[PDB]
Each structure stands twice: as structure tokens, then as C-alpha cells.
Design a protein around this ligand. Structure first.
Ligand SMILES: *[C@@H]1O[C@H](CO)[C@@H](O)[C@H](O)[C@H]1NC(C)=O
Ligand SMILES: *[C@@H]1O[C@H](CO)[C@@H](O)[C@H](O)[C@H]1NC(C)=O
Ligand SMILES: *[C@@H]1O[C@H](CO)[C@@H](O)[C@H](O)[C@H]1NC(C)=O
Ligand SMILES: *[C@@H]1O[C@H](CO)[C@@H](O)[C@H](O)[C@H]1NC(C)=O
Ligand SMILES: [Ca+2]
Ligand SMILES: [Ca+2]
Ligand SMILES: [Ca+2]
Ligand SMILES: [Ca+2]
Lengths: 324, 368, 453, 238
């Protein structure tokens, strides 16, 4: 599956490259989050801008440039080639949607960009882009620990590394984040260890190592104590992307989620929600676990009038745009 | 009508025989390095050079009468972000050295020398706050721009035609021979030719660049296009020069610079200034071209001075009106910059006062 | 503190200012003369020898010669244009054979004059590409070449060209993919020869060879005799590219539009207006254009990019792929890249891009039912033992150029252009150049001798 | 850009999607997901989208009307279907709708790649003729050329353009030379593999003597190579 063709950015400036690295980088300018830069002609150029909401680390603007298409996501709005468009916007090879809790831009055979809207942002790239990319997401050569941080045979700190992949505005001179002093807190109550090493992500321990995620959970605990679940969410996403089946870890106290009356909030639900417009879409799907709202088995979704998930034999039909 | 003639700055043509009978007035050649990367040779062979070394910019290669050297240094994350950082006129087989740095400091034999200076027929002076003129008696003349960034212009008395060597080419009115290296064969590309003229063997060879800096950032694209388009606008102030100098290489320079420059305003204004100065070299007086653009170069002027679009000659000094000035009989193409306003003179303190406030100097003695 | 004969040098003992290891006598800096205000400590070859730059030491009479981002040992040879050089004592010694000057006129109006100048002129009327009929006497010239842009299916963007090769009192019209002959003056023997060089019509005149891609590219190669005595849109061939913008009345202008508007054949024709940048007009092609033209920066053209400057060729490619908004796109991109292909061919290289995905060239077409003479060669033979030239010699020996040629076996050793095949014996060409089979009467019969009676 | 699917008569009446339901009843082939036969193409297409989240396609726009300045060129290019090149086939295969398709496609491709559009629009008719009864060979060097000397290495002359290929190919993957669904001739160029090198290899596109090996996933190796067992005359063995 999507073994090592994924990079991510979450929570308190935590960056995860394709090959498995994790590092914190508290930058606050525009950065080349990834880019086709070892090719005669570039295919994609995805950039991030990270900012502050009062104190919360967020992503304020993404600019994906791909094959002559410019896509600027910011302020809860999407600009396609300079024009605002209403979601979803679809064209040959491109589709952008408000699917689930996020904004997902899939440029078929190029990339898959999920953006939760505030802090998370995840890139899936084609296997043919190996070794030809460069940016915070790394080089996609498959070797994590050895080739991202050697600038002319010298090893760099994540602050320096993230500062190399910097890009100022035409009239902007953004500074660099001075190193954060030592940390504190750690996991005193054991919440990170109890959850991450708990039952839910059992098989996730067999695919993705949790050490960096444990550290990030502790570091977020040092930050506000309503925002420690970002690392758990990211670990769920990564475990789902490697191939393993994450299990439900959310409890009414552990960052509770809500879904509509007939829709349940699941970790690892089938991405293709069967809906009696196409009540058998979920037959031979190929896509890993995805989190979001889902329907209890048997009662497919009703996308024709949006009455929630409905039994197969009580949902409407459509003829010529007329509901029956 | 028949009987009429018109003279360009480089030639004169008479309408007769139903044709133009054209003769060539003498023309001092003009090499230049602009943007820190682009080179316009004496034969007008524009080519970009992304190098990190000191390069023999021009040298009368029969002997070592003079050797204008340029040190070009990498200025950014990418290997194609370069700046000119010095201009080292080496003279008399290296016996004399005039080194104009990037901040304006001028060194005579590695000793700081304020300006103007006048010795060994060499005259160093600032026509304005933007330019430094190094007029030598050997035939050439250097004109170095500091504001907004560092650019160099080299002027040759036509007698040296077909004799020089170096980066700027042999000055023989032939664009195909410019890449004739010392091995007797024309090199292929710009950088292949330049990597034969490095000063130090330990330098890193220049490489050929295809990566347009414009393709990287979209806001950089919009900014650079929206401003550098002022070059090719037929309604623009620059338009007057279009019928003489083709502005396409200048537009390409402006695009590349601004899309690549860290202070892209600096490189944008440098490219526009370069086009303006080349046009003034051909004999066109572009004025009032900074409408809503590059005005921070108006405002940053030293106190008691003001900007001037046409500084066509001498800086008016009080000492000079007292006891004349050997500095001030030099013909240079009219450059722009900050200067004392007309009718006013700068005293030895550097401040600008009218003529009535300034003493007359007898034997070098101040006399109110 | 070193191993090779090169020994260490330290500036602590010497007074400041001595030439340090940076001013090391080297195969490059032995010749220029080093400059540095600071000494550096390092390993330096012993006096009498220099360094190769790799820590070795070499006698100064064996320094490798550097050429075009490369390096050649002493005794290695290279080829530049029409002459060959050999590396000796950090110099190149080259033969002194004269090299055929070259004008290029291709694409949407890109011109490379005889003197190496380059510009773009998008005209519509008839324009004199070259002529000797300009001078204090216009009547002592010989030839004249006019061109104008044909639209091949409409009246819009250019799709092909049309050439009018006047050669003394003769005339040839090159259009639609073939030639003609409108000889009006004295009816003697033709002062030209005609050949099918690959994908080109090539016409020799013993001092001037024209090559037409049959769609839109014209490359002319002139002997050194015609130097300075030509004019038109290929310049005046004076090894001085600054003044090549010389109009009809010889008033060198700085603008290409006026230079072109001068050389229109008919004063009644209207002057071309301001050319408009293609990619700005049609941004929705632009991206595709770059993706197509990026072939120049790829490993297909890795080697040549160090032998021929390809900035302007790439700009022309992108502008042409942006401009062709009325149909026939692959042809525009193909010819824009093929001009660079020919430049590489002429410089020193045999480059073969032409992938089945990218600008394919159907050359199996002339293969009859498995007969396999017709093979694609990236660089053709200098002269072809054609039906029209049974001798096998040629007047202007052109170098290799793209196109597919027949490997005419000894059993059928004559290449016949009018049928495009390898055949045993040829027919006959009349004065106008029409072809007939042996034994067929001409409006006299045809025999091994030819047309006889 | 063209897919031609050929099914046995077994699957008659039991398939669906955008190729109809294969029932020898063309009026009702616009049967949507819920089998509500419509008189409109847009609804029938919108039914069979995989992901219901995807937006429905809007009204298709007539290409030649949109971009009139291409139309003339398009017609001049598409007129190849009326010329004597296709004089014979026009009596065996109805070419009205094919010509309309050619003109529409050559009008539509205003963003680049025009020759491919025209080439495939004509090649659909070429395959119609090829299946019907005729080995038509248009494909002139001026019009839709097909580079087939490319796989010819250094004067080797196996690879020739045949307008109708052999019903089965003795490929490297199929050393038997037999085939399951014998397709008739179709355009392209094929190698005339000589007896000395009688195996056509697709992964190198060449006539060679002895073949290598394919694994379960289908990757290829040269003989004498171990697989992530070695490669031998048997193939992958151990
Ligand atoms: C987003 O856009 C809305 C208008 O659409 C604006 O009112 C708001 O301030 C912007 N920012 C946020 C964080 O909502
Ligand atoms: C990846 O790129 C590096 C960069 O030079 C190269 O050395 C290496 O061989 C490449 N490996 C793969 C598997 O692409
Ligand atoms: C240039 O031409 C003008 C107009 O005839 C004339 O007045 C002027 O003297 C000329 N310049 C010379 C001769 O240097
Ligand atoms: C100018 O150059 C001459 C020639 O070498 C030299 O003799 C003289 O000292 C220099 N200075 C002056 C003021 O003439
Ligand atoms: Ca790596
Ligand atoms: Ca020259
Ligand atoms: Ca000339
Ligand atoms: Ca049916």
C-alpha cells in the first residue's frame, strides 16, 4: 500500500518525511513543503505557510502548483488558477473536495493532498517521483536517516534543514525561528504511553514505530492540554497508510468526536461509503482505512436527499433530476 | 529629403543616391556586467555567467598594460544567485591596484582611499552617490554602480579594437569570435568560455543554468511580470529607446533577476537602471521613469542632497570653483543618482550650501 | 606533509602577500596569471612542474587541453565545424580548411543570419532571404532567394513556406513539398543540382547549397567567396553581426521589424505590425508548450547542450508551440527542436532524438513488402549516388543531416528520388527535370546513355 | 486514448456500464445504475461514476462552435476519410459518425497535441475497416506517421509496419505461440523474428534466441539471474 509515499505535517510544527523521519521545526514563513526539483520539467510544487492562531500552530495557506494549475487554499477558501471555486471542483485529472473533515486535492497520477483546515496536511505521491523531489518531505529515495540532512557532506539540525527549504515573498523578509530551549513535562501521567502502546494501535506497532510520536505527544502535552490528540490522530493516519488496521481509541474524554444521527465517527472505516445511489461501491474498492463519519452496516448512505444513512429499501430513486 | 543627414552616436548617414551613405564615427566600446550574472561584451554578445571566483573581465592580452578584474560571488541558497562583489583594476603588470568594493569603499594598493583622487593619470571620483568613475589614462574608463546593487561598465577608446582579451571579448566587431579562448578555438557556451578566465585554479567552474527562477514562486511570478513588463510597454517611459535598443534581453534579465533575487526589488530596479543607462549610452535621455516604482532610492538620499535623473557631468564642488579641478574634465555617459542641487556646492564638511556660504581657498587656506 | 612530488607550502615563514597554494602553477593558471591578496597553505608541485588539479604533477609541456566543459589529453583530437584540431602544449592546432557559412530561417520566423545573429520576424509577404543583387552594381550578382509563409489549409498561422531560388536566369519554386522550374532566360544546362538529402530538398550551385525541410525550415550554406557581397534577411555575411540589420537603403537599424519591412519584394505590400508574444496570447497552451520543449533540457540532449548554446532555441520552441493555436502543433514543436538537432549535427555530433512518442518519422513507408533498404539515419551520407547523379560525386558536400536513406545494395545500386527506391538502372532527366522510364520517348527515346535520337 | 473491448458471446445480456448491457437491443442501452432507461447521454454517463462524491459532468459543448478558427483545419485534416485513401472502406463501414467524431476532436484539442487527436479519431475508423474485411493502410509520412525503425538496432530489419498484425504473437511471455482470444489484424509494427532469433521479447522489443523469465507479478529478468531461485532454460526454478 502507501508504504513510504507519504509525508505529513501536524500539530506543533511536526514534520514527517517520506522515508520515516520526524522532526519539529517551528518555522513561520512560506516553505517548499515538496517540489519536483530533480527533473528537466517539474510536475508539482506544493508549499506551506505556517502561522499562529492566538497561540495554536496552524497552516494558513497552501499553494500547490502542478502542471500549469495553481491551487491556493487559505481562509477556508480555495483559489483555482486565481478564481474562487465552490467545492467540489473537478476537471480532467484534478478533483478538489470537502470530503469528510478535510479539503482533499487529488491530481491523478501526481499527488494526493489532504488538509484538515487548521494544522494537519498530508501528501501522497506517485512512486515515479522517487529521488526527484526535494523539500521538507525529503527526497523519496527510501533511506530515512542518511540523505535528508547532508548539505554538501555536512549534517544539519532540523532548524537548519527547515531553514534551507525556505522561500520568501517578493517583498517579504521573514526571520528564522530561534531554537526552542529545553523541554519539560514529558509523559508524567503516562497518557501517551498508555494510549499509543495500548490495544488500539497494536498492529500499528508492527508497521510504524511510535518513538517519535511518543515524544511529540509529550511535547504537545507541554503545550495546551486540549491539543495532545494531534499526534494520536497522525499515528492513526500513518498506521492506516502503511496498511495496518487502526482501532478506535477515542473515548468521550480523549478528544471526543461527533457525527450525524445515523452516522458514527469511526477510525478505519471503509473509504467508499456505500450509498443506494451506488449501493455496492464498497465491493471491490482499493483504499486503506480512513477516519470519518460512516454508517452502521446494512444501511447505506442516502446522497439523494441527505436523510442520513437509510435502509436499502426505503431510500429514494432519481429520474431526470426528479426525486421519487 | 535629399541633402539631409542624420548622425547616430556611432555613425552618420546621408540620404543620397536614393540610399543611405553611412560612415562610422569613432565609438568607444562598452563592456558591462549587470545583475551580477549577465555580461554584455564589447561585441554586444549578451550571455549569463553564474560563477564563484574572480574573473579577468578585460585585459589587453598582448601585454599587461591593464587588467580589469571582477569577483563574482554566490549570494543565496541556489548556485545561480550571484552578485558582483568587487572590481579590481590591476595596472602596470599588477604594480598598481584600484579595488572598488560593493559598499563604495575604494582601495588604492589595498589602502583605503577616499574620493576623489588624482594620481598617475588615474582619476577616481563619484559623479553621484550611485556611481564611481575610475578614469585611467591608459585608454579605458570604469563606471561602477553601487545603488541599488553592484554593476560594472567598461569603456574603451576604440584604438584597442581587435586587441583585448578576457570575458568581455576581443572588441573586433564580430560576435562569433568572442569565445576564442587562449587555445585558439571558440568555446561553445558562456560558462565553458568563462571557466578559462578564472583568476584562481582553486575556484569552482561555472555551470550552465536552465532552471528559470520564475517557475518557482507564483507571487514572485506575478510581481516580477507586473513590474518588468514596463520595459516592453510601448506607452511606457522606456518606449523612446525601443526604436534603438531591443529591450528583449533587458526584459529577460529583469525577469531572471527579480524571480531569483532575494531583495527582488533591488534586482528589479537594478535591471531597469541598467536598461536606462544603456539607452543613455546610445544617446537617449530617459527621464521620470520611476513612477510608483523604486522610489526608496529617491528617499534614502543623504541629507542636503537630492536625486537627479541626469547627472551629465561634473559634481559641482566649492573647491573646484575656487581653484579648478582635474577630476571634472572627464566625459562619461550621463548617469543618475543623488547630487547637490544646481547652483549649490558641497563644502569640505560634505554638507550642501549655496555659493555665498562657501569660502574661497587660497593656497589651500580657508577664507570666509 | 604530502605524498606526491608536490610538497607542502605554509605562509607562516613567508612574508604576507606571497602567492600561496591558491596561486598554484596549474594547467589553467599557468597561462592567465593568478591574483590573490592572501596566501594559503597547501600542497604545491615542485618548481618546474604544474598540477593537473587532482594532486598530481605534470610537466608544463603536457597540460591537458580544456574545451567545452571537457578535458582532452595531449594527442587527442577534436572536430570543430568543418575543421579538426589537435591538443598540443595547452593549445589547439587546427587545419585551415574554409568552413561553409550558414543562414537559418525556420519556424514562425526565427532567423539566424550568416554572421551568427539571431532574431524573430513574423512577416507575411515575399521577403528576400538572400541575394548577390546588392552593391555598387546589382547586376554582377548571381543568385537570389525569396521566401514567404504559406498557410497549408487556411489563411492563418504559417504552416509551410515557399522558396523562389533564382539562379542567374533560371528559377526554382519550392512549395507544397516539391520543386519546379520556370527557366525563362537562356536555355542551357542547369547551374544547379537537386538532391533528396534525408528529409530535405538540397540544391547545390557549386558554391551555395540550400536545404529545405519541405515544411518550414531553410538552411543555406555558402562558400567563403560570397563573403560580404550578399544581403537580405540572412545578413551580409561580413563576420559582423551588429550591422546585419541593414535595410534596403543600408541604414543599420536596431529593430528587426524595420529590417524585415525593408526587404519585402513588393512595395505595395503592407508592413508587418508589432509581433505579439505567443505565450501571453494563449496561456492555456503555455504549460503544454514547456512540457514539450523540455526535451531540450533532458538527457536526450544532454551532450549537445555543452556543444551548442540552446537558450534561444528553447525560447523559439516554446514560442512556436504557444503560437500554433490554429492546428498542426506537433509540426511546430518538431521543427523548432529539429533546428537545434541540425545545429548539433553540424557542430560535431550525431544526435538522435526522434522517439516514437516524440516527432516520429515514418520511414518504413518506402519499404516494398519487406524490402528493407530504407533506414533512418540521424546523420546522412555526404553525397548520394542518386538517379540524377549517377557519378556519386557532389558539388557542395553537405555533412550528415536527419532523414532516412536507402541502403541501396549492389544489386540495385541507384537511388531514384521520383519513386524513392533502390533500382538497378536509371531512366533519364530532360532539361526541365522530368523523369521517364528507359525506352520511353520524350516530348527521342530513353536508353542506357539517356535521352538520345 | 482508445479502448476496444471484444467479448465472447457468453457474456451476452449480463454486462453493464458504458458499453451497454450487450443485449442486441440498442434503444435501451442508456440504462443507468437503477436501470431507468433515459433518452439522454449525460444522465447515462453520470450514473456510472465510481465515486458519488464526484461532480456530475455538465452539458458537453460543441467543439467546432467553441473554436471556429480550428474548424477549417480540422475539416482539411478529417477530409482524409472522404478521399481515395478510404474510398473502398466507405462502402463497407458507415463513416458518417466517424467523420463527425474526427471533426469534433480536431476542433476540441485547442490546448496541445492535435496530431494525436486526429490520429486516434481516424484510427477508430481504421480499426472498424480492419475488423470488417479490409487491410487499409493510410498512415502516410505526412499524415499520422508511425516510427517503426526505432526498435531496429543498427541495420537490423525485423521491425516492419504491418497494417494487420498476425492473429497471435510468439512472444517471450507466450513461448508456445498459441493464444486464447485470437484477435484479428490491427495496426502497428511487428518484428519478423528470424529462425535464428525466433522469440519476440516485449520488455526489450527485440527478436532474440532464448527468453528470460517472468515471475508471479510479471517482472522480467535475464537468464542466469536470481529472483527476489535462478533463471534457467526452465525459467525461475529451484
Ligand atoms: C476567513 O474568511 C472569512 C470571510 O469568508 C473572514 O470573515 C474570516 O476572517 C477569515 N478567517 C477566518 C479564520 O475565518
Ligand atoms: C538517488 O539519487 C542519488 C543522487 O545522486 C543517486 O546517487 C542514487 O543512485 C539514486 N538512487 C535511486 C535508487 O534512484
Ligand atoms: C549631426 O546632424 C545635424 C543635423 O544635420 C547637424 O546639425 C550636426 O552638426 C551633425 N553632427 C556633427 C556633424 O557632428
Ligand atoms: C602619466 O603617465 C606618464 C607616462 O608613464 C607618467 O610619466 C606620468 O608620471 C603620469 N602622471 C602624470 C601626472 O603625467
Ligand atoms: Ca533519504
Ligand atoms: Ca569579438
Ligand atoms: Ca554584418
Ligand atoms: Ca440494450
Amino acid at each position: 500500500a502507501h508504504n513510504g509515499r507519504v509525508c505529513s505535517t501536524w500539530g506543533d510544527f511536526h514534520y514527517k518525511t517520506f522515508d520515516g523521519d520526524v522532526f519539529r521545526f517551528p518555522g513561520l514563513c512560506n516553505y517548499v513543503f515538496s517540489e519536483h526539483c530533480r527533473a528537466a520539467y517539474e510536475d508539482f510544487n506544493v508549499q506551506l505557510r505556517r502561522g499562529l492562531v492566538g497561540s495554536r500552530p496552524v497552516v494558513t495557506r497552501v499553494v500547490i502548483k502542478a502542471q500549469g494549475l495553481v491551487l491556493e487554499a487559505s481562509n477556508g477558501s480555495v483559489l483555482i488558477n486565481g478564481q474562487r471555486e465552490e467545492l467540489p471542483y473537478s476537471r480532467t485529472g484534478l478533483l478538489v473536495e470537502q470530503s469528510g473533515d478535510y479539503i482533499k486535492v487529488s491530481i491523478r497520477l501526481v499527488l494526493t493532498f489532504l488538509w484538515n483546515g487548521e494544522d494537519s496536511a498530508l501528501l501522497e505521491l506517485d512512486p515515479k517521483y522517487a529521488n526527484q523531489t526535494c523539500g521538507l518531505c525529503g527526497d523519496f529515495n527510501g533511506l530515512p536517516a542518511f540523505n535528508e540532512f547532508y548539505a554538501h557532506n555536512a549534517r544539519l539540525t532540523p532548524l537548519q534543514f527547515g531553514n534551507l527549504q525556505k522561500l520568501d515573498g517578493p517583498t517579504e523578509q521573514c526571520p528564522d525561528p530561534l531554537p526552542l530551549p529545553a523541554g519539560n513535562c514529558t509523559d508524567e501521567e503516562g497518557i501517551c504511553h498508555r494510549t499509543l502502546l495500548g490495544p488500539a494501535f497494536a498492529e500499528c506497532h508492527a508497521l510504524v514505530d511510535s518513538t517519535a510520536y511518543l515524544a511529540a505527544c509529550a511535547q504537545d502535552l507541554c503545550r495546551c492540554p486540549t491539543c495532545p490528540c494531534a499526534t494520536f490522530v497522525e499515528y492513526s493516519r500513518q498506521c492506516a497508510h502503511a496498511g495496518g488496521q487502526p482501532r478506535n481509541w477515542r473515548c468521550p474524554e480523549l478528544c471526543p468526536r461527533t457525527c450525524p444521527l445515523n452516522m458514527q465517527h469511526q477510525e478505519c472505516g471503509s473509504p467508499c461509503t456505500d450509498t443506494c445511489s451506488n449501493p455496492q461501491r464498497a465491493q471491490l474498492c482499493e483504499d486503506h482505512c480512513v477516519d470519518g463519519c460512516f454508517c452502521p452496516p446494512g444501511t447505506v448512505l442516502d446522497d439523494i436527499t441527505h436523510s442520513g444513512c437509510l435502509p436499502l429499501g426505503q431510500c429514494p430513486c432519481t429520474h431526470g433530476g426528479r426525486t421519487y | 529629403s535629399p541633402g539631409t543627414s542624420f548622425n547616430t552616436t556611432c555613425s552618420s548617414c546621408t540620404c543620397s543616391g536614393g540610399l543611405w551613405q553611412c560612415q562610422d564615427l569613432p565609438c568607444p566600446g562598452t563592456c558591462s556586467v549587470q545583475g551580477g550574472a549577465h555580461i554584455s561584451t564589447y561585441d554586444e554578445k549578451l550571455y549569463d555567467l553564474h560563477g564563484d571566483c574572480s574573473y579577468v573581465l578585460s585585459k589587453k592580452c598582448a601585454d599587461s598594460s591593464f587588467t580589469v578584474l571582477a569577483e563574482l560571488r554566490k549570494c543565496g541558497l541556489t548556485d545561480n544567485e550571484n552578485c558582483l562583489k568587487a572590481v579590481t583594476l590591476s595596472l602596470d603588470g599588477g604594480d598598481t591596484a584600484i579595488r572598488v568594493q560593493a559598499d563604495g569603499g575604494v582601495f588604492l594598493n589595498s589602502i583605503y582611499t577616499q574620493l576623489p583622487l588624482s594620481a598617475a593619470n588615474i582619476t577616481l571620483f563619484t559623479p553621484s552617490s550611485f556611481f564611481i568613475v575610475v578614469q585611467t589614462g591608459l585608454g579605458l574608463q570604469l563606471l561602477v554602480q553601487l545603488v541599488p546593487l553592484m554593476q560594472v561598465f567598461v569603456r574603451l577608446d576604440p584604438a584597442h579594437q581587435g586587441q583585448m582579451c578576457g570575458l568581455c571579448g576581443n572588441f573586433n566587431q564580430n560576435q562569433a569570435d568572442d569565445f576564442t579562448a587562449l587555445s585558439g578555438v571558440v568555446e561553445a557556451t558562456g560558462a565553458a568560455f568563462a571557466n578559462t578566465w578564472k583568476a584562481q585554479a582553486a575556484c569552482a567552474n561555472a555551470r550552465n543554468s536552465f532552471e528559470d527562477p520564475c517557475s518557482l514562486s507564483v507571487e514572485n511570478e506575478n510581481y516580477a511580470r507586473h513590474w518588468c513588463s514596463r520595459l516592453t510597454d510601448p506607452n511606457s517611459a522606456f518606449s523612446r529607446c525601443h526604436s534603438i535598443i531591443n529591450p528583449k534581453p533587458f526584459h529577460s534579465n529583469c525577469m531572471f533577476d527579480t524571480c531569483n533575487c532575494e531583495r527582488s526589488e533591488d534586482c528589479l530596479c537594478a535591471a531597469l537602471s541598467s536598461y536606462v543607462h544603456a539607452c543613455a549610452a546610445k544617446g537617449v535621455q530617459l527621464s521620470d521613469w520611476r513612477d510608483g516604482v523604486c522610489t526608496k532610492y529617491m528617499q534614502n538620499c543623504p541629507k542636503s542632497q537630492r536625486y537627479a535623473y541626469v547627472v551629465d557631468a561634473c559634481q559641482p564642488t566649492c573647491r573646484g570653483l575656487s581653484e579648478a579641478d582635474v577630476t571634472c574634465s572627464v566625459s562619461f555617459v550621463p548617469v543618475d543618482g543623488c547630487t547637490c542641487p544646481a547652483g549649490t556646492f558641497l563644502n569640505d564638511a560634505g554638507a550642501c550650501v549655496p555659493a555665498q556660504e562657501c569660502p574661497c581657498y587660497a593656497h589651500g587656506t580657508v577664507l570666509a | 606533509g604530502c605524498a606526491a612530488p608536490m610538497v607542502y607550502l605554509d605562509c607562516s615563514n613567508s612574508s604576507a602577500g606571497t602567492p600561496g597554494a591558491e596561486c598554484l602553477r596549474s594547467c589553467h593558471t599557468l597561462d592567465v596569471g593568478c591574483f590573490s591578496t592572501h596566501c594559503v597553505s597547501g600542497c604545491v608541485c615542485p618548481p618546474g612542474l604544474v598540477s593537473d588539479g587532482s594532486g598530481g604533477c605534470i610537466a608544463e609541456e603536457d597540460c591537458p587541453c580544456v574545451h567545452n566543459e571537457a578535458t582532452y589529453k595531449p594527442g587527442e583530437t577534436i572536430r570543430v565545424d568543418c575543421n579538426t584540431c589537435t591538443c598540443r602544449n595547452r593549445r589547439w592546432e587546427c587545419s585551415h580548411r574554409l568552413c561553409l557559412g550558414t543562414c537559418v530561417a525556420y519556424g514562425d520566423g526565427h532567423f539566424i543570419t550568416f554572421d551568427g545573429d539571431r532574431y524573430s520576424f513574423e512577416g507575411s509577404c515575399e521577403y528576400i532571404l538572400a541575394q548577390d543583387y546588392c552593391g555598387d552594381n546589382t547586376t554582377h550578382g548571381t543568385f537570389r532567394i525569396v521566401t514567404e509563409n504559406i498557410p497549408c489549409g487556411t489563411t492563418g498561422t504559417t504552416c509551410s513556406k515557399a522558396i523562389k531560388l533564382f539562379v542567374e536566369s533560371y528559377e526554382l519554386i519550392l512549395q507544397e513539398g516539391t520543386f519546379k522550374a520556370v527557366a525563362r532566360g537562356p536555355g542551357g544546362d542547369p547551374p544547379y543540382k537537386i538532391r533528396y538529402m534525408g528529409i530535405f530538398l538540397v540544391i547545390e550551385t557549386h558554391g551555395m547549397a540550400v536545404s529545405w525541410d519541405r515544411k518550414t525550415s531553410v538552411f543555406i550554406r555558402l562558400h567563403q567567396d560570397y563573403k560580404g557581397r550578399v544581403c537580405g534577411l540572412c545578413g551580409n555575411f561580413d563576420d559582423n553581426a551588429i550591422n546585419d540589420f541593414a535595410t534596403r537603403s543600408r541604414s543599420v537599424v536596431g529593430d528587426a521589424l524595420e529590417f524585415g519591412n525593408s526587404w519585402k519584394l513588393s512595395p505595395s505590400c503592407p508592413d508587418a505590425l508589432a509581433p505579439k508574444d505567443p505565450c501571453t496570447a494563449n496561456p492555456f497552451r503555455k504549460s503544454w508548450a514547456q512540457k514539450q520543449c523540455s526535451i531540450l533540457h533532458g538527457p536526450t540532449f544532454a551532450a549537445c547542450r555543452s556543444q551548442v548554446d540552446s537558450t534561444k532555441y528553447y525560447e523559439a520552441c516554446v514560442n512556436d508551440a504557444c503560437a500554433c493555436d490554429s492546428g498542426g502543433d506537433c509540426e511546430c514543436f518538431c521543427t523548432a527542436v529539429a533546428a537545434y538537432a541540425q545545429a548539433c549535427h553540424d557542430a560535431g555530433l550525431c544526435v538522435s532524438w526522434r522517439t516514437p512518442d516524440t516527432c516520429p518519422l515514418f520511414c518504413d513507408f518506402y519499404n516494398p513488402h519487406g524490402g528493407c533498404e530504407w533506414h533512418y539515419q540521424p546523420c546522412g551520407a555526404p553525397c548520394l549516388k542518386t538517379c540524377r547523379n549517377p557519378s556519386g560525386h557532389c558539388l557542395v558536400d553537405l555533412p550528415g543531416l536527419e532523414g532516412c536513406y536507402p541502403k541501396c545494395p549492389p544489386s540495385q545500386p541507384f537511388f531514384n528520388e521520383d519513386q524513392m527506391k533502390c533500382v538497378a538502372q536509371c531512366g533519364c532527366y530532360d532539361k526541365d527535370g522530368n523523369y521517364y522510364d528507359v525506352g520511353a520517348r520524350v516530348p527521342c527515346n530513353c536508353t542506357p546513355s539517356g535521352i538520345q535520337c
